[PDB]
Amino acid sequence: GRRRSVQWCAVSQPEATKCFQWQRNMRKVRGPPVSCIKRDSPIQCIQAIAENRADAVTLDGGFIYEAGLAPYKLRPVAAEVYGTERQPRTHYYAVAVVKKGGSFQLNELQGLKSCHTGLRRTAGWNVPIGTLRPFLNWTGPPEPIEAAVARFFSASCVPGADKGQFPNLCRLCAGTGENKCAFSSQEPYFSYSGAFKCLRDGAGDVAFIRESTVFEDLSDEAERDEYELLCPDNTRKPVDKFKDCHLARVPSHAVVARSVNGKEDAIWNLLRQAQEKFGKDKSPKFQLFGSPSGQKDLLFKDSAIGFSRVPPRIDSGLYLGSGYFTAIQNLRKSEEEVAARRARVVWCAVGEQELRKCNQWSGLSEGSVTCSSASTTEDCIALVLKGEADAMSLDGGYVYTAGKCGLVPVLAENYKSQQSSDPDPNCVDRPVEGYLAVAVVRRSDTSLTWNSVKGKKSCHTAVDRTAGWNIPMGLLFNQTGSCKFDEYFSQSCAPGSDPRSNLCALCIGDEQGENKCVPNSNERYYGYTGAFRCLAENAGDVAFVKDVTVLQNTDGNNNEAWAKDLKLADFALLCLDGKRKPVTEARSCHLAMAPNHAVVSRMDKVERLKQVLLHQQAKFGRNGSDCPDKFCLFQSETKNLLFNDNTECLARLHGKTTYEKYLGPQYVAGITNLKKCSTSPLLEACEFLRK
Numbered sequence: 001g002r003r004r005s006v007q008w009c010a011v012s013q014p015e016a017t018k019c020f021q022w023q024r025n026m027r028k029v030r031g032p033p034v035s036c037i038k039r040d041s042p043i044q045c046i047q048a049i050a051e052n053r054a055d056a057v058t059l060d061g062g063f064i065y066e067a068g069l070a071p072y073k074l075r076p077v078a079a080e081v082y083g084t085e086r087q088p089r090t091h092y093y094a095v096a097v098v099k100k101g102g103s104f105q106l107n108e109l110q111g112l113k114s115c116h117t118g119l120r121r122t123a124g125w126n127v128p129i130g131t132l133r134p135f136l137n138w139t140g141p142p143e144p145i146e147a148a149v150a151r152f153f154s155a156s157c158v159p160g161a162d163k164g165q166f167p168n169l170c171r172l173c174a175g176t177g178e179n180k181c182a183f184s185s186q187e188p189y190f191s192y193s194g195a196f197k198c199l200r201d202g203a204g205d206v207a208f209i210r211e212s213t214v215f216e217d218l219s220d221e222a223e224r225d226e227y228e229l230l231c232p233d234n235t236r237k238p239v240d241k242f243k244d245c246h247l248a249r250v251p252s253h254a255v256v257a258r259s260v261n262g263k264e265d266a267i268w269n270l271l272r273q274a275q276e277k278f279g280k281d282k283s284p285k286f287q288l289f290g291s292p293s294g295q296k297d298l299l300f301k302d303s304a305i306g307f308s309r310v311p312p313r314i315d316s317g318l319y320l321g322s323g324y325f326t327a328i329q330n331l332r333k334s335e336e337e338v339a340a341r342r343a344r345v346v347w348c349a350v351g352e353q354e355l356r357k358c359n360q361w362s363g364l365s366e367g368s369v370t371c372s373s374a375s376t377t378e379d380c381i382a383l384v385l386k387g388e389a390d391a392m393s394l395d396g397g398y399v400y401t402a403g404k405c406g407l408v409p410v411l412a413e414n415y416k417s418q419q420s421s422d423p424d425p426n427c428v429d430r431p432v433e434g435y436l437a438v439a440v441v442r443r444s445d446t447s448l449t450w451n452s453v454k455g456k457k458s459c460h461t462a463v464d465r466t467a468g469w470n471i472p473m474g475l476l477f478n479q480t481g482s483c484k485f486d487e488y489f490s491q492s493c494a495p496g497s498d499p500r501s502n503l504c505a506l507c508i509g510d511e512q513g514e515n516k517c518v519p520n521s522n523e524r525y526y527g528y529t530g531a532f533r534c535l536a537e538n539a540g541d542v543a544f545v546k547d548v549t550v551l552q553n554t555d556g557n558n559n560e561a562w563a564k565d566l567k568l569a570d571f572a573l574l575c576l577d578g579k580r581k582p583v584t585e586a587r588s589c590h591l592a593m594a595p596n597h598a599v600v601s602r603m604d605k606v607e608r609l610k611q612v613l614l615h616q617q618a619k620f621g622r623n624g625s626d627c628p629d630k631f632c633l634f635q636s637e638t639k640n641l642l643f644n645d646n647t648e649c650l651a652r653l654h655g656k657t658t659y660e661k662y663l664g665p666q667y668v669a670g671i672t673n674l675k676k677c678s679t680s681p682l683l684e685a686c687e688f689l690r691k
């Protein structure tokens, strides 16, 4: 192959015909060319694109899933946009609606009565029943789900269900005579309005519908407070909290392409152009969105009004979201895979050394903890979003991002009250107090102060971390108002930065010079320890770390040759008033306070993760029965792997159960403004998915 044209795949003769029109008109107006191939089915178009016989095709959620699998590995590159300009819909939410009053939760549905939009529909069946799979007592695909579902609810309306085999599923349906349980408007409990009316009517205890149906069928904003949602965390909430309380986010159909040499640029150019010429109400000569009489949704849905470009970080799993993703997954898995995956905790390790420690923990954990790994923190967060991993300990900076992505904090790393402090048997309930971010210098140059730090050489733990980045660059940002972070300092090591930039100039990679500036421990200047090393080995002039870092690495507290001979007295802190103080005085000479690192997860895993963690820490923590004679969760000899080495225990949050509450408005205000200057791939991905 290797042409200039985008080759589109059609799944029908009618579609093929519209494609040829398209091609005709693009050549007419001198826009990017589009060519056409035809197949008999969506999966045939997915094969063709994988095999380079085509480039693009529009798919729904179910086919986006299949397309992401091997041996296809396609990804969404552009989404359909619905609604109107200034009211565009890029998705909706599968929510569970019950009446105001009850106290039963998502986990206590067994025996109740249910209203569904219809058999094998997304919101009404695929998502709810995939979510409830673990409770469902279902052998596996060998036997039909309907049988188990019928054995779970006492009665349901599920339009289209086989009233012969599964009469229970049809009991509450309102159709007359043989139209009872019909997959059609002749059954009043059909589709979104139907199943909701089925709830309103007292027929059912729960309706599995989409968020918009409530405000659309409900005329007054007082009718709606008689209804709430069931959340995956097993709470209830009002109907307008769907953004935070939903079974699934159902995304718009998307154009998919291959992840390797997808021609994504050509495809987007095409769609952008086509949309501007033949988009909605742009030309009587040809209509991108619109089908001839008798036809519907050829190539694109007739209700589309344009396209949104999918951020590059986003693959099929991320596009669909953990709720949707895992529900589809659950419907294909055995009861064994599903019970096992449910009970196990998948930690995400960042880099090879963390994975090694994790795998050690795993081995001792009595099956309750397993490992996955990625090469960056953001890559781990995406694994958790996809349900391929469950948990990890994050810097406050990453807690923010994880939070925008819909993750929640679970427990916090508790540090000792002061550097000088006795053991506290009630650590687990001792409220976190944060730690001090400091700027550390060598003592030699007495002329260096906070006021002369700009234009010098800097050592940072990593981009987007709190003490290493957000705090110092935030401070600098106030004073100068510039978003030119790569110009604050002449040269830096700031892992996670562009390897070309000045920001990576001082980083040294691993022993072979590989992995320069990668934000994991392969980079020897990474993290608290690495940033301090960058200063001690004289690469940088200032290190942005925490106050305990210098302690942990001087006066023989670190074994490594570079650190063994370092004395406390050879380092100073830069105070914001231009003074210099000894490191023992950080309390009165720090940049700012920083929030404790926290363990984050998905809502669905929170309770299980708590239980496993408190157990594991009872065994391997500082008061550990198996620590140190077997294994210590909170030790890595000045390496801070998985957790910070100065963690006393993992402690409860005392209601501070969202990232906003845990970090505080102040902190969140500050990062928010920071992010104006620039953002990360995952941050952009997650704002897209919540747009």
Ligand SMILES: [Cl-]
Residues within 6 Å of the ligand: 117, 121, 122, 123, 124, 125
């Ligand atoms: Cl639906």
Ligand SMILES: [Cl-]
Residues within 6 Å of the ligand: 395, 461, 462, 465, 466, 467, 468, 469, 528, 545
């Ligand atoms: Cl940091």
